[PDB]
Design a protein around this ligand. Structure first.
Ligand SMILES: OC[C@H]1O[C@@H](O[C@H]2[C@H](O)[C@@H](O)[C@H](O)O[C@@H]2CO)[C@H](O)[C@@H](O)[C@H]1O
Length: 461
């Protein structure tokens, strides 16, 4: 039962709430290590917890790899978004983070630590504003400002540290020295004046991807991403990821989960309790699979429950009720299907002859109220009203799950095993365009006209 429930606080094997907010993860040896920070009673840096696991669902407490006792300046300060990276050369784990006074946010500086072991007590080094010796001034103080940060290890073995500089208006990508413990140079300035936060740097197939968020404090916002063949330059524009609130969370880290079947990229986020006036320690977590439609097209769907099999390297949606269904039209006798049985995103939904194919099989996931999710079997995509249309003739397609109301459907029994499937967005029924009775008939959205082309029978398979 390797299933995770988003919007909650995961519990470790001990039965206690996991506290690794704004944390990250590292895959070394046979274990996945989850680092993170958490405040105390005075909302100050208490410690950087570390959790270990092989299945990525059951986490074991390993203590604080970093504490407020590890250093004199760690006593009364703010530490958030701590990330850990491994060095093949040295053989030691280097840890980066964001440091503040605890009184204010004027000291936008980065902090560094390291240890010979992953779950061992780290030794704090120093806190500083990158390029301090260069003499450069960034808003009153020497050295580039450094708040929200993250680490990345390239294929060539070069370490990288990224953080928000120039009052969180610009992103600075710093190249680290071979030891990962110092900054070697300023690789490039990314997305200037665009004010992107909570950056996550990853790589797939010679393509670098940068998942960022907006700057609106606790309030969740529209997450975005970009790609490039080179870190120095060639970066694309910003493309929206997830919904308008990133499913009520903020991106924190993204790691490749490799297994026998292949590689599935895992997304980590934080549902900050600050949104509803709660303390940082009451923040929940949101884990979702990061899917790659193409080298240039990314997808971040929202599953209320996610199943993970680290061994095989598969991250997909968890369906509570695996019961398969066929939706047969009363008028045509055809069943609900996907055009050309495609698994592509935004694929047109059409009616087709009952041929017992996968494309014609659908799950039904309850999502509160009298509404449900109609999910295709051949493709985990959900039945969706294109562009959240509220007009007659509005085409229906299969799209990535995004918790949108244009993906919620209510079944209204009309008798004899037939239903009127209305959308939650406007209330219009699933309709076969122009009363079509042939294969390829466009499935659309239309007002309840009492027509038989709007009536569907639910059949178990
Ligand atoms: O493309 C399908 C997709 O559309 C979303 O609606 C978007 C729409 O894509 C976009 O063109 C428009 O500018 O904004 C709409 C929402 O704000 C749906 O949300 C999604 O479920 C899919 O249907």
């Amino acid at each position: 039962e390797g299933v995770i429930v988003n919007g909650t606080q995961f519990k470790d094997t001990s039965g206690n709430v996991i506290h690794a907010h704004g944390g990250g993860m590292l895959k070394h040896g046979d274990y996945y290590y989850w680092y993170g920070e958490y405040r105390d009673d005075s909302n100050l840096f208490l410690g950087v917890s570390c959790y270990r696991s092989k299945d990525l669902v059951n986490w074991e407490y390993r203590g604080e790899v970093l504490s407020r006792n590890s250093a004199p300046e760690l006593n009364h300060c703010n530490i958030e978004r701590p990330k850990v990276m491994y060095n093949a050369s040295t053989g030691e784990f280097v840890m980066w983070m964001h440091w503040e006074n605890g009184i204010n946010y004027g000291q936008a500086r980065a902090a560094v630590a390291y240890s010979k072991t992953p779950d061992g007590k780290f030794t704090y080094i120093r806190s500083f504003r990158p390029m301090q010796d260069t003499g450069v001034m960034d808003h009153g103080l020497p050295g580039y400002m450094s708040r929200d940060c993250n680490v990345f290890v390239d294929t060539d073995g070069k370490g990288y540290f990224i953080s928000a500089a120039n009052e969180n208006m610009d992103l600075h990508l710093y190249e680290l020295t071979p030891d990962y413990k110092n900054i070697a140079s300023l690789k490039a300035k990314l997305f200037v004046g665009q004010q992107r936060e909570a950056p996550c740097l990853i790589k797939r197939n010679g393509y670098y991807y940068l998942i960022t968020s907006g700057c609106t404090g606790w309030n969740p916002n529209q997450a975005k991403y970009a790609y490039s063949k080179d870190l120095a330059s060639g970066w694309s524009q910003l493309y929206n990821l997830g919904n308008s609130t990133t499913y009520r969370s903020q991106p924190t880290f993204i790691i490749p989960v490799q297994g026998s079947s292949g590689t599935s990229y895992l997304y980590m986020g934080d549902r900050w309790a600050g949104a509803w006036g709660g303390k940082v320690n009451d923040s929940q977590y949101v884990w979702l699979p990061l899917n790659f439609i193409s080298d240039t097209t990314l997808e971040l769907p929202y599953y209320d429950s996610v199943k993970i099999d680290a061994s095989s390297g598969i991250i997909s949606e968890y369906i509570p009720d695996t019961t398969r269904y066929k939706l047969v039209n009363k008028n045509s006798g055809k069943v609900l299907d996907v055009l050309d049985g495609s698994v592509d995103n935004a694929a047109q939904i059409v009616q087709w002859t009952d041929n017992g194919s996968l494309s014609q099989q659908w799950y039904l996931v309850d999502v509160g109220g009298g509404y449900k999710k109609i999910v295709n079997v051949k493709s985990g995509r959900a039945l969706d009203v294109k562009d959240e249309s509220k007009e007659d003739g509005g085409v229906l397609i299969q799209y990535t799950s995004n918790g949108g109301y244009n993906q919620h459907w209510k079944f209204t029994d009309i008798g004899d095993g037939y239903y009127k499937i209305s959308s939650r967005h406007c209330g219009k029924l699933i309709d076969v365009r122009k009363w079509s009775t042939e294969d390829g008939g466009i499935i659309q959205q239309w007002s309840d006209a009492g027509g038989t082309n709007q009536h569907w029978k639910l059949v178990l398979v």
